[PDB]
Amino acid sequence: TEKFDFGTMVQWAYDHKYAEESKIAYEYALAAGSDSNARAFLATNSQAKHVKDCATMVRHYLRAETQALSMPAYIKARCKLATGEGSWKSILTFFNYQNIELITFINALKLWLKGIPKKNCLAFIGPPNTGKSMLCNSLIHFLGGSVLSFANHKSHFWLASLADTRAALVDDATHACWRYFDTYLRNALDGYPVSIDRKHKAAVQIKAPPLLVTSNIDVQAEDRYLYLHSRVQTFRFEQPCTDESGEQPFNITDADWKSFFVRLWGRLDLIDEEEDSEEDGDSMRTF
Amino acid sequence: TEKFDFGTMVQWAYDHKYAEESKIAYEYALAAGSDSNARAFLATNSQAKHVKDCATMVRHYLRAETQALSMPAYIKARCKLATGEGSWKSILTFFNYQNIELITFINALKLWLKGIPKKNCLAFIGPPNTGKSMLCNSLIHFLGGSVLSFANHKSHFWLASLADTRAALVDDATHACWRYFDTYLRNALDGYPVSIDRKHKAAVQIKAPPLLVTSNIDVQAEDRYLYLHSRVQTFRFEQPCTDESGEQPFNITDADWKSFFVRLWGRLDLIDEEEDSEEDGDSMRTF
Amino acid sequence: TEKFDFGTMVQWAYDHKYAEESKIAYEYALAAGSDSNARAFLATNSQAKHVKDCATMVRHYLRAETQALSMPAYIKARCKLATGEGSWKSILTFFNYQNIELITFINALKLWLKGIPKKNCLAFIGPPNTGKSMLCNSLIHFLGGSVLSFANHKSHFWLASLADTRAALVDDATHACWRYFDTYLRNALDGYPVSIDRKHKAAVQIKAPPLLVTSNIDVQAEDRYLYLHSRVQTFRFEQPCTDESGEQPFNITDADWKSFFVRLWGRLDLIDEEEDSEEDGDSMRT
Amino acid sequence: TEKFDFGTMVQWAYDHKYAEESKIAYEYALAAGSDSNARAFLATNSQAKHVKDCATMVRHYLRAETQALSMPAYIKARCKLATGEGSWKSILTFFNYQNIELITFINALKLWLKGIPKKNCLAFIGPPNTGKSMLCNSLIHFLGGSVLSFANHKSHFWLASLADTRAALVDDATHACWRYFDTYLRNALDGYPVSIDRKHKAAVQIKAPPLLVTSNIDVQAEDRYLYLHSRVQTFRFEQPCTDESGEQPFNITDADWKSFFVRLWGRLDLIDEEEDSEEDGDSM
Amino acid sequence: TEKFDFGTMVQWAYDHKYAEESKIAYEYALAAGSDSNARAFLATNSQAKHVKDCATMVRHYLRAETQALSMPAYIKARCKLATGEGSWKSILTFFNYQNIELITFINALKLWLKGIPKKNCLAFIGPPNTGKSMLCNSLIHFLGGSVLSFANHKSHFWLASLADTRAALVDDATHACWRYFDTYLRNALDGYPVSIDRKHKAAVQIKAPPLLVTSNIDVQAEDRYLYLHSRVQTFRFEQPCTDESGEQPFNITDADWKSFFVRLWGRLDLIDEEEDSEEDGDSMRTFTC
Amino acid sequence: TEKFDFGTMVQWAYDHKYAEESKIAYEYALAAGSDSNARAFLATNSQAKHVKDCATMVRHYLRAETQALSMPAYIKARCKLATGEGSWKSILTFFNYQNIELITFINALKLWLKGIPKKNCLAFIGPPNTGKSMLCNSLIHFLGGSVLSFANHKSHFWLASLADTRAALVDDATHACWRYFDTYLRNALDGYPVSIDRKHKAAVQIKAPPLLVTSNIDVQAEDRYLYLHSRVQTFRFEQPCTDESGEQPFNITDADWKSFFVRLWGRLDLIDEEEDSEEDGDSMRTF
DNA sequence: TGTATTTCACACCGCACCTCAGCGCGTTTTTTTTTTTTTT
DNA sequence: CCCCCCCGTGCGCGCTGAGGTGCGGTGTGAAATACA
């Protein structure tokens, strides 16, 4: 019985972080119970157009908000989302199982996070079924990164995801992958800016976000990869996780990483400058 | 009043589950006999745009309705959609014909449906003309899952169908297909997220849905596929099958599957949480 | 003075089955002489949009109408549209010249049309210039199907012509085509749904329609196609159907097939006994 | 005197046969000096949309008009748009020079134009540089038919240019071209509808337009082409004409063909009824 | 702040010859200190659509204005826009350097500019760095024709240029470009029309403009281009002008070409009848209202 | 009257140099607190279209402004913009270390800037990791140029950026890149016009912006490229510099270039800028 | 009884409100393109 | 001879013009108050 207001629906959509078309349409039509704006939305002869614009607008808002946040603020906004209970002792026990003292790994992650160039890629190289996939992919899951797949490297759009995410991982790199890295992506693995081709739009020149790679092939030994000995940090995982112990004796969850970052806020050198004293407030495109 | 009202058209099109534009337009022009909104629509000089919006809204509603169901609800809906005359005897008789107990198949099916990692691929290995594809095609028809095709693996978009359906079938996997699974797509058999493209879209990262493959090759006997012995459950098909007057001595219906799942809702351990609304008015708030 | 009304224009377009846009525009601008709505169209300020929308609406109507006709009704609607006068005698005498009893071809059509799996492909085998392509392509043309092309099997885009039509012809299937059928379309000849793929689009999962394949290779004698024995009914076209002395005595115009069907509605196990009121309601789809 | 009337502008545009967008827009802005409607058009704030729609409408009318016309009427049209004055003497002397009585060419064109299967391909077969390509190309241009090319045979996609035009030609058909005609384009010479595989399109089922082949290979003589013995009217070219002599390397201009048709209606058998008797056309 | 008059904006754009969108928009918005129509445009809330339409209209007007000109009058125009004090001795000495006396090139240009078929392409074939691309590009720049490029032969839009320009050119003619000339653009050399596919609205039944090509592949010798043998006039540049050990090499300038045409007007046979009727006494304002 | 004023929004966007849709939309939504016009914007029913048009208009303005500046004026405009503290002494010591007197580099730069034909490509060729990448990347960063990547070369659209900027670089060009330059990019590198294709827009015939390339592969020495000895200039970097880890004398900053150009305004033949007689230029408005 | 001194009373003429719907209204690269690997 | 359920809401941004209705800027007097 009132005039539709697109802004209210954009704000409500952003409240629940609904971005895709079908979800916003379905959830709003189900929410027409106690939302007079929704009941004004249903009887409008341009529902589809409004859904399309609402999704686009929420996408703009979320993309800009994510891009704005600096690394300490981003890891804070992800320690907020890490739900569960569990200490960091799993991390230390796993690394001592792999006979790698923690301090080296901390002294490499410290640099890797800052994107210091020539140190912008970890390598976890070891035999299959050694526990590189679980660790690396969990660390990507807790940093909200995207997995890059080498299957479609013949389509040069496979690097499109590097325009958004903050920790990319390509897993089980073959020899062709290492040669590809040495030959094409010399700049990105260095850390220097590199162009990114995207779909239907314009190429965006961006920094090279931090990476992670797991591969059976060692690179600190193959002398034909002489240009990668100094540009990566290789940690050797040479022991098996899935041993005779019934379950995988070591498994890693968001609680482990969350308490890992809360306890190691200092030794990773993370800090926001001065102002964290207020009551909550956020973008409000509703009026 | 005679003014056309788009919400009514969307409600009607969703009502009978017409998604494609042509069927909506034809059926609605037919229904114009006894629908005031329809006899209004025929005269609205912007018919094509209304039809396109109605089809798009129905597609949005249906797609976001299917993805909002957890697995037991999905199987319940598929059982509700299946009609015919049959029983589970018309299946267990076939299994006893191939000389495999059914209890082992159930102990495997439970895990396979739950998507548990490292146990999320059933391989049916048998010589040609023993009935593999018959059982697999029947089962994947019931689960409403798509079937892949290793023909197009030169063109990396053959995985595009993996983004929607919840039970993928790959029939007649050659040596090349098994090597591809061993090298590239190990993550899916594990159960870790993978990246998949969709023609004119972006690589949507999703968990890999359960699979079902038929191959003459015994992966659990070869030595090149040593790293698949811990990600594949196999069932051997040995006794002969269809060679008799164009009638395979065993054809698996949908009534068979319906009575199978319904009769074994306890052994497969499928259930829902605290329930106080099952057989009620369907939420048709899309009007 | 006379407002435009898109409804009566789409009704007029559907009256004459003017699907394509240019024909709409030209014929309607011509008809403006004695149709007030057409003068309103001519004076209208957005003519091209109306032509485009009319084309789209007519295409929707016609395509949906085709997809909704059950197989006996569609055979009746393809029997109505075939024009010419002839006789089934050409089919009968062609077969009896190939020393093949007609009753064999009937007892194969009875199944091949019903889509029964494992009996849903009719192969015509014989050395070339024996009349295979004559009968096969005449029959596919009657059924309104689409002639496929085994050549482009380097690409997987050559099955795209089966997303719509209800009968396909694969002409001169050599060993490569037979191997391709035995390897990737094992399902199709078994009637169960297949996964076709088109160019610059997504794959669709549809039932495999019936088929007619012409080949020089007796699959039911080969051994590597041991699987193919159970889903292909061979037909031995041996005699020379073409010119015995310079002029091809035998050719199957649409009238021959039409009279064949009309006289053989019973033995094919179909039904066209509607005869409802006079011909049919067929009121309107304005 | 206001409210620019788009119907008038499209009627005028078809009136002057202005089809391309740029011509319509420019000349109309030029005629706006003495045309009130054009002066209204200039002040309109959406001139581009009007120009685009006018081009689309004129193209619709002209394309439908061209497609509608039947073959006797179509030739009666293309026998006027042929410009300039010539003389059939050149074509007669050319054919007499090639030892072919022109009566033979008339009695073969009689079949070839009707599209009658079993007689729907003319092979102008002779040694290189004997005027075969000259004559075939002149005749095919007169009909305004697309000239094909078998040098693109490495793909199937050399047939997509045949979707529209009413006549065809292939240049110096090698054995591969004859093999292609014998194997894959069998229907086109028999009258049945054949599929056409192009790039980023679909198998368009269109009838075969009448064909015309230039080759050095006498298909009527080889024994591995029994299926083309009866669907081809091969013509013999022996004597050379397209040489560098002080005399005429005989030219065959469109006017030559114009006078040829004008004189050869009677023996070429094209009907004249079902006309409109100078009934104009309009779009308003 | 009176109602925006899109006609006035298009008139201003075509007056200043601004065609591309960005230059139109920015230059107009900078002229708001004196044009009431400029503030009128700034006031509206649909600036992008208006600038898009203005660009398209100016494009139409320039396109037709150029294509109206006849090639003799077009050479007159391109001989007015040439300024300097050049001489034709440079081109004569360049040709006599390569041992091809100028009369041959004159007797080829006469036939080429007339666009007669079978003679509608000159290939300047020679080893790298002998003076082929220098002369080719000098003549093309003077004649205002658009220089094509083969690096993008995919997407099939590399041909829209010669839909509206009077002399195209393709340098670095690799084997693939020769193959395209053999199997795609035969109609271009044969005089027959070719359908050039513009990238936004529709193709054109445009006749192929006179061409030019620089290559090292002596197509008059390779038998794989038997069709291309007899439809190009090959001029062979064997003597090189790559003198890196002293005096400066040749360079042909616009004024050199202008003096060449002015001097050899009669021998090049350019004469469109006249222009003296009552249509062109003094009427000049025909631009627009 | 508190209605939206698109002119105000476009002027503001250009005022802050916001270009892309995401930044302008989100940050203006934030500004809607105390910028009455943005508060009106939030209530508009076509927010997305207005955001898109604002992005397009700001692109038009920025592009047509930058393309106007003559090259020495561009260098001056970047010169004032360059902030920080540093001197030209860094560049002098770096080059005099490499056993190249600075006069050689200066007399090559004074030609490279003007795009003089046959000297329009300055390649820094030397043994691996001797300190070339840092210098080329820093100079391109100062001149506001773009750095392409070779990976896109399978798509011809990777040169779309050449129609805008005035200093183009590709770094670590492989051997296929050298063949590409010798075969397709002949005229452009010689000093001629060349066509450029772009996405959704028309192709333009624009001259070739000056270039900088680095590689370990020599082009003046390999007789395969007998065709590039007279059209490029090659500087041989030989000493061990590129560590950035142990001593790092190649630590080039942007203030290095700023004071380089400020101190070399007579021997770079640049004084005759667009500011030959600069007595009144203070003007700026694009309402 | 003659006459200064003033709002109600029917209204010139209206400033300006609200009231409809006939005028404007839209995206298309990327993949596929046959190109030369991709075992042999 | 009187109560055991039908019922899930409102529209192309924006105009804008004839239409007529009213309390007043101004229509401006015979009646009406009080004077002398």
Author numbering:
A (entry chain D), B (entry chain E), F (entry chain C): 308 to 594
C (entry chain F): 308 to 593
D (entry chain A): 308 to 591
E (entry chain B): 308 to 596
Text of the article:
Helicases use the energy of nucleoside triphosphate (NTP) hydrolysis to translocate and unwind DNA, providing the single-stranded template (ssDNA) for accurate copying by DNA polymerase. A hexamer of the C-terminal helicase domain (E1HD) can function alone to unwind dsDNA in vitro. The E1HD subunit can be sub-divided into the collar domain and the NTPase motor domain that form rings in the E1HD structure.
Here we present a near-atomic resolution (3.9 Å) cryo-EM structure of E1 revealing clearly all arms of the RF and the dsDNA unwinding point for an AAA+ hexameric helicase. The structure demonstrates unambiguously the positions of the dsDNA, the 3′ssDNA active strand within the entire central channel of the E1HD and the 5′ssDNA passive strand, positioned on the top of the collar ring. The dsDNA separation point, the RFJ, is located at the entrance to the collar tunnel. In the E1 helicase, dsDNA is separated at the entrance to the collar domain ring, as the AAA+ motor pulls one ssDNA strand through the complex and the RFJ against the collar ring. The OBD of subunit B interacts with the dsDNA while the OBD from subunit E interacts with the 5′ passive ssDNA strand and is located close to the side of the E1HD collar ring. While the dsDNA sequence of the fork does not contain an E1BS-like sequence, the cryo-EM structure indicates that OBD B interacts with the dsDNA via an interaction between the DBL and the major groove at the sequence TGTGA in the passive DNA strand, 16-20 nucleotides from the RFJ. In the E1RF cryo-EM structure, the 5′ ssDNA is diverted from the separation point at an angle of 95° relative to the dsDNA axis, passing in a groove between E1 subunits D and E. Second, the 5′ ssDNA is trapped in a groove between collar subunits D and E where the TNS loop of subunit D and Lys310 in the inter-domain linker of subunit E escort the unwound 5′ ssDNA from the complex. In the E1RF complex, as in E1HD/ssDNA/ADP, six nucleotides of the 3′ ssDNA strand form a right-hand helix with the β-hairpins of the AAA+ domains, before it exits from the channel. The β-hairpin of subunit B does not contact the 3′ ssDNA either, since its His507 is turned away from ssDNA compared to the crystal structure. Our observations, therefore, appear to be consistent with the coordinated escort mechanism for ssDNA translocation, although a different conformational state appears to be captured in the cryo-EM structure, where the subunit A β-hairpin has disengaged from ssDNA and has not yet migrated back to the top of the complex to re-engage with ssDNA.
